[PDB]
Design a binder for this molecule. Sequence first.
Ligand SMILES: [K+]
Ligand SMILES: [K+]
Lengths: 337, 267
Amino acid sequence: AFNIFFMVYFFIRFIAASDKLWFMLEMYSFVDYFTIPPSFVSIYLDRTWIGLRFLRALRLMTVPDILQYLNVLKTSSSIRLAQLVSIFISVWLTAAGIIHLLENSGDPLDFDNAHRLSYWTCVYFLIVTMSTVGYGDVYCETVLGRTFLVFFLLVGLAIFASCIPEIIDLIGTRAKYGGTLKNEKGRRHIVVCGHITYESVSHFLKDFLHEDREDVDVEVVFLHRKPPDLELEGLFKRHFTTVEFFQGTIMNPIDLQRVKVHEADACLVLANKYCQDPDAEDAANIMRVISIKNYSDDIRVIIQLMQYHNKAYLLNIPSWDWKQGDDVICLAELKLG
Amino acid sequence: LKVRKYWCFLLSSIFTFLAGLLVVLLWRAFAFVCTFMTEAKDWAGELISGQTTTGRILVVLVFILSIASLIIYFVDASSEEVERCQKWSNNITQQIDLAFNIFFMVYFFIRFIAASDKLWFMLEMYSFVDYFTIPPSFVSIYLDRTWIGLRFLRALRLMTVPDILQYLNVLKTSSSIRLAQLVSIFISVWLTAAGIIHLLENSGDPLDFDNAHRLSYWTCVYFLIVTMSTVGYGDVYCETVLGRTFLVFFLLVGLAIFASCIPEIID
Ligand SMILES: [K+]
Ligand SMILES: [K+]
Protein backbone atom coordinates (compact mmCIF):
# COMPACT_ATOMS: atom_id res chain seq x y z
CA ALA A 1 0.00 0.00 0.00
CA PHE A 2 2.86 2.40 0.76
CA ASN A 3 4.39 1.55 -2.63
CA ILE A 4 1.00 1.99 -4.35
CA PHE A 5 1.29 5.78 -4.03
CA PHE A 6 5.08 5.54 -4.47
CA MET A 7 5.16 3.93 -7.92
CA VAL A 8 2.63 6.46 -9.18
CA TYR A 9 4.71 9.02 -7.28
CA PHE A 10 7.63 8.16 -9.56
CA PHE A 11 5.31 8.87 -12.50
CA ILE A 12 5.08 12.58 -11.66
CA ARG A 13 8.89 12.60 -11.73
CA PHE A 14 9.05 10.68 -15.03
CA ILE A 15 6.08 12.36 -16.75
CA ALA A 16 7.55 15.87 -16.45
CA ALA A 17 11.28 15.16 -16.22
CA SER A 18 13.36 18.01 -17.61
CA ASP A 19 15.96 15.51 -18.88
CA LYS A 20 14.30 12.49 -20.46
CA LEU A 21 17.58 10.54 -20.75
CA TRP A 22 19.83 11.85 -17.97
CA PHE A 23 17.07 11.13 -15.43
CA MET A 24 17.50 7.39 -16.08
CA LEU A 25 20.53 7.01 -13.79
CA GLU A 26 19.67 9.57 -11.10
CA MET A 27 20.46 8.17 -7.67
CA TYR A 28 16.93 8.37 -6.26
CA SER A 29 15.27 7.06 -9.42
CA PHE A 30 17.88 4.30 -9.73
CA VAL A 31 16.78 2.76 -6.43
CA ASP A 32 13.10 2.67 -7.40
CA TYR A 33 13.66 0.71 -10.62
CA PHE A 34 15.13 -2.05 -8.46
CA THR A 35 12.32 -1.83 -5.86
CA ILE A 36 9.12 -1.01 -7.78
CA PRO A 37 8.92 -4.35 -9.69
CA PRO A 38 9.39 -6.22 -6.38
CA SER A 39 6.02 -4.70 -5.41
CA PHE A 40 4.48 -6.55 -8.37
CA VAL A 41 6.41 -9.69 -7.38
CA SER A 42 4.35 -10.45 -4.27
CA ILE A 43 1.00 -10.12 -6.07
CA TYR A 44 1.17 -12.81 -8.79
CA LEU A 45 2.80 -15.77 -7.01
CA ASP A 46 1.87 -15.25 -3.30
CA ARG A 47 5.56 -15.52 -2.31
CA THR A 48 7.68 -12.68 -0.94
CA TRP A 49 11.42 -12.66 -0.25
CA ILE A 50 13.94 -10.31 1.36
CA GLY A 51 14.00 -8.31 -1.88
CA LEU A 52 16.03 -5.20 -2.69
CA ARG A 53 13.87 -3.02 -0.41
CA PHE A 54 16.92 -2.47 1.81
CA LEU A 55 17.95 0.08 -0.84
CA ARG A 56 15.25 2.34 0.62
CA ALA A 57 17.87 3.27 3.24
CA LEU A 58 19.39 5.55 0.58
CA ARG A 59 16.39 7.83 1.18
CA LEU A 60 18.10 8.86 4.44
CA MET A 61 20.37 11.11 2.36
CA THR A 62 17.38 13.43 1.87
CA VAL A 63 16.76 13.65 5.64
CA PRO A 64 18.99 16.74 6.15
CA ASP A 65 17.12 18.49 3.32
CA ILE A 66 13.84 18.40 5.27
CA LEU A 67 15.72 19.69 8.33
CA GLN A 68 16.34 22.85 6.29
CA TYR A 69 12.60 23.10 5.60
CA LEU A 70 11.78 22.83 9.31
CA ASN A 71 14.64 25.25 10.15
CA VAL A 72 16.12 22.77 12.63
CA LEU A 73 19.65 23.54 11.36
CA LYS A 74 19.61 27.15 10.17
CA THR A 75 23.37 27.62 9.86
CA SER A 76 25.07 26.48 6.67
CA SER A 77 28.07 25.05 8.53
CA SER A 78 25.83 22.65 10.46
CA ILE A 79 24.10 21.64 7.21
CA ARG A 80 27.39 20.69 5.54
CA LEU A 81 28.41 18.39 8.39
CA ALA A 82 24.84 17.07 8.58
CA GLN A 83 25.17 16.08 4.92
CA LEU A 84 28.25 13.90 5.41
CA VAL A 85 26.81 11.96 8.35
CA SER A 86 23.70 11.24 6.24
CA ILE A 87 25.60 9.49 3.44
CA PHE A 88 27.76 7.72 6.04
CA ILE A 89 24.72 6.17 7.73
CA SER A 90 22.92 5.54 4.43
CA VAL A 91 25.92 3.80 2.85
CA TRP A 92 26.55 1.81 6.03
CA LEU A 93 22.95 0.58 6.24
CA THR A 94 22.52 -0.19 2.53
CA ALA A 95 25.78 -2.15 2.47
CA ALA A 96 24.60 -4.22 5.44
CA GLY A 97 21.49 -5.10 3.45
CA ILE A 98 23.66 -6.33 0.59
CA ILE A 99 25.70 -8.40 3.06
CA HIS A 100 22.48 -9.81 4.52
CA LEU A 101 21.21 -10.76 1.07
CA LEU A 102 24.52 -12.07 -0.29
CA GLU A 103 24.99 -14.37 2.73
CA ASN A 104 21.55 -15.71 3.65
CA SER A 105 20.49 -16.40 0.05
CA GLY A 106 23.76 -18.17 -0.77
CA ASP A 107 25.57 -18.70 -4.04
CA PRO A 108 23.28 -19.21 -7.07
CA LEU A 109 25.26 -22.26 -8.23
CA ASP A 110 25.20 -24.68 -5.28
CA PHE A 111 22.82 -22.94 -2.82
CA ASP A 112 24.24 -24.95 0.09
CA ASN A 113 26.98 -22.71 1.52
CA ALA A 114 24.50 -20.29 3.10
CA HIS A 115 25.28 -18.91 6.56
CA ARG A 116 22.49 -17.56 8.75
CA LEU A 117 23.26 -13.91 9.53
CA SER A 118 21.02 -11.26 11.07
CA TYR A 119 20.68 -7.62 10.08
CA TRP A 120 21.65 -6.70 13.65
CA THR A 121 24.85 -8.68 13.04
CA CYS A 122 25.45 -7.21 9.57
CA VAL A 123 25.56 -3.63 10.86
CA TYR A 124 27.97 -4.78 13.57
CA PHE A 125 29.96 -6.57 10.86
CA LEU A 126 30.61 -3.41 8.82
CA ILE A 127 31.13 -0.98 11.72
CA VAL A 128 34.23 -2.91 12.80
CA THR A 129 35.33 -3.34 9.17
CA MET A 130 35.24 0.40 8.48
CA SER A 131 37.23 1.01 11.67
CA THR A 132 39.77 -1.61 10.48
CA VAL A 133 39.50 -3.58 13.72
CA GLY A 134 38.42 -6.97 12.41
CA TYR A 135 37.46 -9.11 15.40
CA GLY A 136 36.78 -12.11 13.16
CA ASP A 137 34.03 -13.56 15.36
CA VAL A 138 31.63 -13.00 12.44
CA TYR A 139 32.84 -13.25 8.84
CA CYS A 140 31.49 -13.76 5.34
CA GLU A 141 31.52 -17.32 3.99
CA THR A 142 29.71 -17.11 0.64
CA VAL A 143 31.97 -16.74 -2.39
CA LEU A 144 29.75 -13.99 -3.81
CA GLY A 145 29.76 -12.22 -0.45
CA ARG A 146 33.55 -12.44 -0.22
CA THR A 147 33.83 -10.77 -3.64
CA PHE A 148 31.82 -7.82 -2.30
CA LEU A 149 34.20 -7.33 0.64
CA VAL A 150 37.12 -7.10 -1.79
CA PHE A 151 35.30 -4.55 -3.95
CA PHE A 152 33.61 -2.48 -1.24
CA LEU A 153 36.79 -2.06 0.80
CA LEU A 154 38.61 -0.91 -2.35
CA VAL A 155 35.91 1.55 -3.42
CA GLY A 156 35.18 2.49 0.19
CA LEU A 157 38.80 3.35 0.97
CA ALA A 158 39.08 5.38 -2.23
CA ILE A 159 35.80 7.19 -1.50
CA PHE A 160 36.86 7.74 2.12
CA ALA A 161 40.24 9.11 1.00
CA SER A 162 38.71 11.34 -1.70
CA CYS A 163 36.46 13.74 0.26
CA ILE A 164 37.11 13.34 4.00
CA PRO A 165 40.84 14.29 3.85
CA GLU A 166 40.01 17.55 2.04
CA ILE A 167 36.74 18.80 3.55
CA ILE A 168 36.63 17.16 7.00
CA ASP A 169 40.13 18.45 7.83
CA LEU A 170 39.03 22.05 7.23
CA ILE A 171 36.22 21.81 9.80
CA GLY A 172 38.55 20.56 12.54
CA THR A 173 40.92 23.54 12.53
CA ARG A 174 39.83 26.40 14.80
CA ALA A 175 41.35 29.37 16.59
CA LYS A 176 42.89 28.99 20.04
CA TYR A 177 42.65 32.57 21.36
CA GLY A 178 39.28 34.05 22.22
CA GLY A 179 36.30 33.68 24.50
CA THR A 180 34.95 35.68 27.40
CA LEU A 181 37.30 36.19 30.34
CA LYS A 182 36.67 33.69 33.13
CA ASN A 183 34.89 35.18 36.14
CA GLU A 184 35.89 34.56 39.76
CA LYS A 185 34.41 35.62 43.08
CA GLY A 186 36.21 38.66 44.45
CA ARG A 187 38.48 38.83 41.40
CA ARG A 188 40.58 41.97 40.90
CA HIS A 189 42.18 42.42 37.49
CA ILE A 190 43.58 45.06 35.15
CA VAL A 191 43.46 45.31 31.36
CA VAL A 192 46.63 46.05 29.39
CA CYS A 193 46.24 47.18 25.77
CA GLY A 194 48.30 48.90 23.10
CA HIS A 195 51.77 47.75 22.07
CA ILE A 196 52.23 44.16 23.26
CA THR A 197 55.73 42.82 22.61
CA TYR A 198 58.23 40.66 24.50
CA GLU A 199 60.66 43.25 25.87
CA SER A 200 57.77 45.60 26.74
CA VAL A 201 55.46 43.18 28.56
CA SER A 202 58.34 41.44 30.34
CA HIS A 203 59.62 44.65 31.93
CA PHE A 204 56.13 45.50 33.19
CA LEU A 205 55.60 41.98 34.54
CA LYS A 206 58.92 42.03 36.42
CA ASP A 207 57.72 44.87 38.66
CA PHE A 208 53.97 44.19 38.77
CA LEU A 209 54.46 40.50 39.67
CA HIS A 210 57.71 41.04 41.56
CA GLU A 211 59.06 38.47 44.00
CA ASP A 212 59.23 40.77 47.04
CA ARG A 213 55.90 42.56 46.57
CA GLU A 214 53.60 42.11 49.56
CA ASP A 215 50.71 39.76 49.00
CA VAL A 216 48.09 41.33 46.72
CA ASP A 217 46.61 39.23 43.91
CA VAL A 218 45.65 41.22 40.81
CA GLU A 219 45.26 39.40 37.50
CA VAL A 220 46.69 40.89 34.31
CA VAL A 221 44.64 40.72 31.10
CA PHE A 222 46.34 41.44 27.77
CA LEU A 223 44.16 42.43 24.80
CA HIS A 224 46.08 42.62 21.52
CA ARG A 225 44.81 42.42 17.96
CA LYS A 226 47.61 40.14 16.75
CA PRO A 227 48.25 36.66 18.17
CA PRO A 228 51.41 36.41 20.28
CA ASP A 229 54.60 35.08 18.74
CA LEU A 230 56.75 32.27 20.13
CA GLU A 231 59.02 34.69 22.01
CA LEU A 232 56.08 36.16 23.95
CA GLU A 233 54.07 32.92 24.18
CA GLY A 234 56.66 31.44 26.53
CA LEU A 235 56.42 34.47 28.80
CA PHE A 236 52.67 33.92 29.22
CA LYS A 237 53.28 30.25 30.02
CA ARG A 238 55.59 31.13 32.92
CA HIS A 239 52.82 33.34 34.36
CA PHE A 240 49.79 31.19 33.56
CA THR A 241 48.36 31.57 37.07
CA THR A 242 48.18 35.39 36.90
CA VAL A 243 48.37 36.40 33.21
CA GLU A 244 45.81 35.66 30.49
CA PHE A 245 45.76 36.76 26.85
CA PHE A 246 42.73 37.52 24.70
CA GLN A 247 42.74 38.34 20.99
CA GLY A 248 40.80 41.48 20.17
CA THR A 249 40.81 45.25 19.86
CA ILE A 250 40.23 47.70 22.70
CA MET A 251 38.30 49.83 20.20
CA ASN A 252 35.71 47.10 19.61
CA PRO A 253 32.84 47.33 22.14
CA ILE A 254 32.33 43.57 21.82
CA ASP A 255 35.94 42.91 22.84
CA LEU A 256 35.52 45.33 25.74
CA GLN A 257 32.75 43.10 27.11
CA ARG A 258 34.94 40.01 26.67
CA VAL A 259 37.68 41.36 28.97
CA LYS A 260 35.08 42.60 31.50
CA VAL A 261 36.14 46.24 31.50
CA HIS A 262 33.64 47.39 34.13
CA GLU A 263 35.05 44.77 36.54
CA ALA A 264 38.63 45.91 35.91
CA ASP A 265 40.36 48.02 38.54
CA ALA A 266 42.36 50.01 35.99
CA CYS A 267 43.20 50.06 32.28
CA LEU A 268 46.80 50.38 31.08
CA VAL A 269 47.80 51.54 27.59
CA LEU A 270 51.33 50.90 26.32
CA ALA A 271 53.06 52.93 23.61
CA ASN A 272 55.23 51.75 20.73
CA LYS A 273 58.61 53.33 21.46
CA TYR A 274 59.99 52.30 18.04
CA CYS A 275 57.56 54.21 15.81
CA GLN A 276 58.34 56.33 12.77
CA ASP A 277 55.71 58.95 13.68
CA PRO A 278 55.29 59.60 17.42
CA ASP A 279 52.36 61.93 16.72
CA ALA A 280 50.45 59.20 14.88
CA GLU A 281 51.15 56.70 17.67
CA ASP A 282 50.02 59.20 20.32
CA ALA A 283 46.79 59.94 18.44
CA ALA A 284 45.97 56.23 18.21
CA ASN A 285 46.77 55.72 21.90
CA ILE A 286 44.62 58.69 22.93
CA MET A 287 41.74 57.42 20.79
CA ARG A 288 41.96 54.12 22.68
CA VAL A 289 41.33 56.00 25.94
CA ILE A 290 38.21 57.59 24.42
CA SER A 291 36.80 54.14 23.63
CA ILE A 292 37.49 52.92 27.17
CA LYS A 293 36.02 56.08 28.71
CA ASN A 294 32.99 55.84 26.42
CA TYR A 295 32.33 52.26 27.56
CA SER A 296 32.76 53.06 31.27
CA ASP A 297 32.97 56.55 32.74
CA ASP A 298 34.37 55.59 36.17
CA ILE A 299 37.39 53.63 34.95
CA ARG A 300 40.99 54.44 35.85
CA VAL A 301 43.21 54.79 32.77
CA ILE A 302 47.00 55.14 32.73
CA ILE A 303 48.54 55.81 29.32
CA GLN A 304 52.08 55.94 27.96
CA LEU A 305 52.43 59.02 25.76
CA MET A 306 55.30 59.54 23.32
CA GLN A 307 55.31 63.35 23.12
CA TYR A 308 54.67 66.01 25.74
CA HIS A 309 52.67 68.33 23.47
CA ASN A 310 50.03 65.60 23.02
CA LYS A 311 49.04 65.78 26.70
CA ALA A 312 46.58 68.58 25.93
CA TYR A 313 44.43 66.26 23.79
CA LEU A 314 43.78 64.01 26.79
CA LEU A 315 42.46 67.05 28.68
CA ASN A 316 39.77 67.50 26.02
CA ILE A 317 38.08 64.24 27.09
CA PRO A 318 35.27 65.19 29.51
CA SER A 319 35.62 61.91 31.42
CA TRP A 320 39.36 62.39 32.01
CA ASP A 321 39.85 63.31 35.68
CA TRP A 322 43.31 63.53 37.21
CA LYS A 323 41.90 63.47 40.75
CA GLN A 324 39.93 60.29 40.07
CA GLY A 325 43.10 58.38 39.22
CA ASP A 326 43.77 58.97 35.54
CA ASP A 327 47.42 59.74 34.90
CA VAL A 328 49.74 60.27 31.92
CA ILE A 329 53.27 58.86 31.68
CA CYS A 330 55.18 60.87 29.07
CA LEU A 331 58.25 58.91 27.98
CA ALA A 332 59.97 61.92 26.40
CA GLU A 333 59.46 64.14 29.45
CA LEU A 334 60.46 61.49 32.01
CA LYS A 335 63.44 60.07 30.12
CA LEU A 336 65.09 63.41 29.37
CA GLY A 337 64.03 64.81 32.74
CA LEU B 1 19.07 -15.57 40.59
CA LYS B 2 15.37 -16.08 41.35
CA VAL B 3 13.97 -12.95 39.67
CA ARG B 4 15.65 -9.90 38.16
CA LYS B 5 16.31 -7.28 40.82
CA TYR B 6 18.73 -4.79 39.23
CA TRP B 7 15.76 -3.15 37.49
CA CYS B 8 14.54 -1.70 40.79
CA PHE B 9 18.15 -0.98 41.78
CA LEU B 10 18.41 1.14 38.64
CA LEU B 11 14.88 2.42 39.29
CA SER B 12 16.13 3.60 42.68
CA SER B 13 18.96 5.25 40.75
CA ILE B 14 16.32 6.54 38.34
CA PHE B 15 14.18 7.73 41.26
CA THR B 16 16.95 9.86 42.77
CA PHE B 17 18.27 11.02 39.39
CA LEU B 18 14.78 12.15 38.36
CA ALA B 19 14.14 13.49 41.87
CA GLY B 20 16.28 16.51 41.03
CA LEU B 21 14.32 16.81 37.78
CA LEU B 22 11.17 17.25 39.89
CA VAL B 23 12.12 18.84 43.23
CA VAL B 24 14.19 21.61 41.61
CA LEU B 25 12.27 22.50 38.43
CA LEU B 26 9.01 22.84 40.40
CA TRP B 27 10.22 25.28 43.08
CA ARG B 28 12.97 27.56 41.75
CA ALA B 29 11.05 29.63 39.20
CA PHE B 30 8.12 30.63 41.45
CA ALA B 31 9.95 33.36 43.40
CA PHE B 32 10.69 35.82 40.57
CA VAL B 33 7.30 37.55 40.40
CA CYS B 34 7.29 38.77 44.02
CA THR B 35 22.44 29.82 55.28
CA PHE B 36 22.14 29.41 51.52
CA MET B 37 23.76 32.80 50.94
CA THR B 38 26.57 32.64 53.50
CA GLU B 39 27.63 29.00 53.14
CA ALA B 40 27.84 29.35 49.35
CA LYS B 41 30.78 31.74 49.73
CA ASP B 42 32.54 29.19 51.94
CA TRP B 43 31.58 26.25 49.72
CA ALA B 44 33.04 27.95 46.64
CA GLY B 45 36.37 28.00 48.48
CA GLU B 46 35.70 24.88 50.54
CA LEU B 47 35.48 22.74 47.38
CA ILE B 48 36.85 24.62 44.35
CA SER B 49 38.67 27.86 45.20
CA GLY B 50 40.62 26.53 48.19
CA GLN B 51 44.22 27.72 48.37
CA THR B 52 45.84 26.36 51.55
CA THR B 53 43.35 24.28 53.57
CA THR B 54 39.74 25.36 52.89
CA GLY B 55 39.50 23.46 49.60
CA ARG B 56 42.57 21.23 49.45
CA ILE B 57 41.72 19.26 52.60
CA LEU B 58 38.18 18.57 51.37
CA VAL B 59 39.45 17.75 47.87
CA VAL B 60 42.06 15.26 49.12
CA LEU B 61 39.46 13.10 50.87
CA VAL B 62 37.08 12.84 47.89
CA PHE B 63 39.40 11.52 45.17
CA ILE B 64 41.90 9.47 47.20
CA LEU B 65 39.05 7.55 48.82
CA SER B 66 37.28 7.33 45.46
CA ILE B 67 40.43 5.60 44.21
CA ALA B 68 40.22 3.49 47.37
CA SER B 69 36.56 2.93 46.50
CA LEU B 70 37.74 1.83 43.06
CA ILE B 71 40.29 -0.52 44.64
CA ILE B 72 37.66 -2.18 46.84
CA TYR B 73 35.44 -2.34 43.76
CA PHE B 74 38.09 -4.43 41.98
CA VAL B 75 37.97 -7.25 44.54
CA ASP B 76 34.26 -7.76 43.84
CA ALA B 77 34.77 -7.05 40.13
CA SER B 78 37.12 -10.04 39.95
CA SER B 79 34.39 -12.17 41.56
CA GLU B 80 32.66 -14.57 39.19
CA GLU B 81 29.15 -13.73 40.41
CA VAL B 82 27.48 -10.59 39.09
CA GLU B 83 24.71 -10.48 41.76
CA ARG B 84 25.84 -12.33 44.89
CA CYS B 85 24.17 -12.62 48.30
CA GLN B 86 26.16 -12.38 51.54
CA LYS B 87 25.66 -11.33 55.15
CA TRP B 88 26.73 -7.67 55.19
CA SER B 89 27.52 -7.72 58.93
CA ASN B 90 31.28 -8.39 59.07
CA ASN B 91 32.58 -8.76 55.53
CA ILE B 92 36.12 -7.75 54.58
CA THR B 93 35.06 -4.78 52.41
CA GLN B 94 31.25 -4.56 52.49
CA GLN B 95 31.32 -2.12 55.42
CA ILE B 96 34.00 0.17 53.98
CA ASP B 97 32.37 0.95 50.63
CA LEU B 98 29.12 1.94 52.34
CA ALA B 99 31.07 3.80 55.03
CA PHE B 100 33.10 5.66 52.39
CA ASN B 101 29.85 6.60 50.65
CA ILE B 102 28.28 7.68 53.96
CA PHE B 103 30.39 10.86 53.97
CA PHE B 104 30.18 11.01 50.16
CA MET B 105 26.40 11.25 49.80
CA VAL B 106 26.30 13.97 52.43
CA TYR B 107 29.34 15.39 50.64
CA PHE B 108 27.16 15.84 47.56
CA PHE B 109 24.74 17.78 49.78
CA ILE B 110 27.23 20.62 50.31
CA ARG B 111 27.46 20.83 46.51
CA PHE B 112 23.67 20.74 46.05
CA ILE B 113 22.73 22.91 49.05
CA ALA B 114 24.78 25.90 47.86
CA ALA B 115 24.93 25.32 44.10
CA SER B 116 25.23 28.57 42.17
CA ASP B 117 23.13 27.09 39.33
CA LYS B 118 20.18 25.13 40.70
CA LEU B 119 19.25 23.70 37.28
CA TRP B 120 22.48 23.60 35.26
CA PHE B 121 24.15 21.64 38.08
CA MET B 122 21.84 18.69 37.35
CA LEU B 123 23.89 17.38 34.42
CA GLU B 124 27.40 18.31 35.58
CA MET B 125 29.81 15.46 34.87
CA TYR B 126 30.87 14.83 38.46
CA SER B 127 27.35 15.12 39.88
CA PHE B 128 25.97 12.96 37.06
CA VAL B 129 28.05 9.98 38.21
CA ASP B 130 26.87 10.22 41.82
CA TYR B 131 23.15 10.07 40.96
CA PHE B 132 23.85 6.66 39.40
CA THR B 133 26.01 5.50 42.34
CA ILE B 134 24.48 7.01 45.50
CA PRO B 135 21.20 4.99 45.36
CA PRO B 136 23.25 1.79 44.92
CA SER B 137 24.56 2.51 48.43
CA PHE B 138 20.97 2.25 49.69
CA VAL B 139 20.49 -0.90 47.59
CA SER B 140 22.70 -3.14 49.73
CA ILE B 141 21.02 -2.12 53.01
CA TYR B 142 17.37 -3.17 52.51
CA LEU B 143 17.65 -6.56 50.77
CA ASP B 144 21.07 -7.91 51.91
CA ARG B 145 22.10 -8.48 48.26
CA THR B 146 24.81 -6.55 46.42
CA TRP B 147 25.72 -6.72 42.73
CA ILE B 148 28.44 -5.33 40.46
CA GLY B 149 26.56 -2.02 40.40
CA LEU B 150 27.48 1.18 38.56
CA ARG B 151 30.35 1.91 40.97
CA PHE B 152 32.79 1.45 38.08
CA LEU B 153 31.75 5.00 37.11
CA ARG B 154 33.91 6.17 40.04
CA ALA B 155 36.84 5.84 37.62
CA LEU B 156 35.72 9.17 36.15
CA ARG B 157 37.10 10.76 39.33
CA LEU B 158 40.57 10.17 37.86
CA MET B 159 39.99 13.23 35.66
CA THR B 160 40.44 15.38 38.78
CA VAL B 161 43.80 13.74 39.59
CA PRO B 162 45.89 16.30 37.62
CA ASP B 163 44.10 19.12 39.47
CA ILE B 164 45.51 17.97 42.82
CA LEU B 165 48.94 17.71 41.20
CA GLN B 166 48.70 21.48 40.71
CA TYR B 167 47.93 21.89 44.42
CA LEU B 168 51.00 19.84 45.39
CA ASN B 169 53.10 21.68 42.76
CA VAL B 170 54.20 18.37 41.22
CA LEU B 171 53.73 19.79 37.70
CA LYS B 172 54.40 23.53 37.95
CA THR B 173 54.65 24.24 34.22
CA SER B 174 51.43 24.84 32.29
CA SER B 175 52.62 22.81 29.28
CA SER B 176 52.99 19.69 31.43
CA ILE B 177 49.53 20.29 32.93
CA ARG B 178 47.87 20.40 29.50
CA LEU B 179 49.35 17.05 28.47
CA ALA B 180 48.62 15.65 31.93
CA GLN B 181 44.97 16.56 31.35
CA LEU B 182 44.59 14.54 28.15
CA VAL B 183 46.14 11.37 29.59
CA SER B 184 43.71 11.62 32.53
CA ILE B 185 40.57 11.50 30.38
CA PHE B 186 42.17 8.80 28.23
CA ILE B 187 42.69 6.51 31.22
CA SER B 188 39.36 7.46 32.82
CA VAL B 189 37.38 6.82 29.62
CA TRP B 190 39.27 3.57 29.00
CA LEU B 191 38.58 2.24 32.51
CA THR B 192 34.94 3.33 32.71
CA ALA B 193 34.20 1.77 29.31
CA ALA B 194 35.73 -1.51 30.48
CA GLY B 195 33.33 -1.45 33.43
CA ILE B 196 30.40 -1.08 31.03
CA ILE B 197 31.74 -3.99 28.97
CA HIS B 198 32.11 -6.06 32.14
CA LEU B 199 28.53 -5.29 33.18
CA LEU B 200 26.97 -5.66 29.72
CA GLU B 201 28.56 -9.10 29.23
CA ASN B 202 28.47 -10.86 32.61
CA SER B 203 24.91 -9.78 33.44
CA GLY B 204 23.59 -10.80 30.02
CA ASP B 205 20.62 -9.63 28.01
CA PRO B 206 17.54 -8.72 30.11
CA LEU B 207 15.23 -10.76 27.86
CA ASP B 208 16.66 -14.30 27.89
CA PHE B 209 19.46 -14.05 30.51
CA ASP B 210 21.16 -17.14 29.09
CA ASN B 211 23.69 -15.75 26.59
CA ALA B 212 26.03 -14.49 29.31
CA HIS B 213 29.78 -14.90 28.80
CA ARG B 214 32.13 -14.88 31.78
CA LEU B 215 34.61 -12.03 31.31
CA SER B 216 37.04 -10.53 33.81
CA TYR B 217 37.88 -6.88 34.37
CA TRP B 218 41.52 -7.74 33.64
CA THR B 219 40.29 -9.05 30.28
CA CYS B 220 37.99 -6.08 29.62
CA VAL B 221 40.84 -3.56 29.83
CA TYR B 222 42.85 -5.76 27.48
CA PHE B 223 39.78 -5.95 25.23
CA LEU B 224 39.54 -2.18 24.72
CA ILE B 225 43.28 -1.42 24.52
CA VAL B 226 43.55 -3.50 21.34
CA THR B 227 40.24 -2.10 20.04
CA MET B 228 41.41 1.51 20.37
CA SER B 229 44.65 0.59 18.58
CA THR B 230 42.55 -1.03 15.80
CA VAL B 231 44.44 -4.32 16.09
CA GLY B 232 41.59 -6.71 16.85
CA TYR B 233 43.13 -10.05 17.80
CA GLY B 234 39.69 -11.64 18.16
CA ASP B 235 40.71 -14.07 20.90
CA VAL B 236 38.23 -12.28 23.18
CA TYR B 237 35.06 -10.73 21.79
CA CYS B 238 31.64 -9.56 22.93
CA GLU B 239 28.77 -12.03 22.57
CA THR B 240 25.79 -10.31 24.23
CA VAL B 241 23.48 -8.44 21.86
CA LEU B 242 23.37 -5.44 24.20
CA GLY B 243 27.16 -5.50 24.48
CA ARG B 244 27.55 -5.65 20.70
CA THR B 245 25.37 -2.54 20.38
CA PHE B 246 27.79 -0.67 22.65
CA LEU B 247 30.79 -1.55 20.47
CA VAL B 248 28.99 -0.07 17.46
CA PHE B 249 28.17 3.13 19.35
CA PHE B 250 31.39 3.57 21.31
CA LEU B 251 33.63 3.10 18.27
CA LEU B 252 31.56 5.68 16.39
CA VAL B 253 31.58 8.24 19.20
CA GLY B 254 35.13 7.31 20.17
CA LEU B 255 36.51 7.83 16.67
CA ALA B 256 34.68 11.17 16.38
CA ILE B 257 35.93 12.26 19.81
CA PHE B 258 39.45 11.05 18.97
CA ALA B 259 39.38 12.93 15.65
CA SER B 260 37.95 16.12 17.20
CA CYS B 261 40.63 17.19 19.71
CA ILE B 262 43.78 15.08 19.21
CA PRO B 263 44.39 16.13 15.56
CA GLU B 264 44.29 19.82 16.54
CA ILE B 265 45.95 20.07 19.96
CA ILE B 266 48.19 16.97 20.11
CA ASP B 267 49.79 17.85 16.77
K1 LIG C 1 43.15 -4.66 12.44
K1 LIG D 1 42.17 -7.89 13.20
